[PDB]
Amino acid sequence: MDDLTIEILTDDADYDLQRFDCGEEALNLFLTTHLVRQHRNKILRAYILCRNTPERQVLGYYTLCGSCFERAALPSKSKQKKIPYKNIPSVTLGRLAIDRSLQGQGWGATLVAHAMNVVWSASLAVGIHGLFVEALNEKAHTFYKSLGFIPLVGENENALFFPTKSIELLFT
């Protein structure tokens, strides 16, 4: 573990996958088949945290897609005018996971910093208002909230937000 890197998935699909275990087999079985299929279908952008060696065994990953958000129903919009805004762009961090080997070593927060880094560099190229993340349980929820993310409540509960302005701030 002297030589970890985080690269975009090189589409060739030449990594070492099944020798990975993050502690919960939904993310595991997502990496098993879903991750490469959905990366090469361009539904997500799959970043791999692995070792800088020819063998290239995976120790973590995250997934970044584009997204767009919208309110339920805009009420009482006759104040002055209404120019509709229906495709409000954002980035969504689909799922993130570290191997059980590297748990507890800040590596989830650094993967988050890397994802926010890519989101920032994209914000310079296209319009992005903020970063949504999903949290399937109590622990991912607390993890994400301890990094600046704001919790949404009510049929949006497992979803937290971090505005791109504060991402710009994180890299002062």
Binding site: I6, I43, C65, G66, S67, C68, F69, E70, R71, A72, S90, T92, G106, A109, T110, V112, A113, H114, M116, N117, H129, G130, F132, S146, L147, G148, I150, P151, L152, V153, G154, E155, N156, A159, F161, F162, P163, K165, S166, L169, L170, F171
Partner: protein, 81 residues
């Protein structure tokens, strides 16, 4: 330009012929148009995040006066440099 071969049960084929005659298309036209339209709307439904009253409120509040990154996130940012 391309081709897909769909092996189809007989009940489903009778049903699709019925429906493709209801819309005076062919079985091929009906199947492909159904596939394309449902694909479009499945993808549109995946990509979007409909926020309710309070989720929308807090997202707006975060956009106007954005927070300061915590010390954990800043340490994480300094690590990968």
């Amino acid at each position: 330009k391309q081709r897909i071969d769909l092996r189809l049960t007989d009940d489903d084929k009778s049903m699709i012929e019925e429906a493709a005659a209801i819309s005076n298309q062919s079985v091929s036209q009906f199947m492909l148009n159904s596939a394309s339209q449902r694909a479009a709307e499945v993808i549109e439904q995946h990509r979007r995040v409909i926020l309710n009253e309070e989720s929308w409120t807090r997202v707006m509040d975060a956009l106007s006066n954005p927070p300061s990154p915590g010390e954990k996130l800043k340490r994480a940012a300094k690590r990968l440099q």
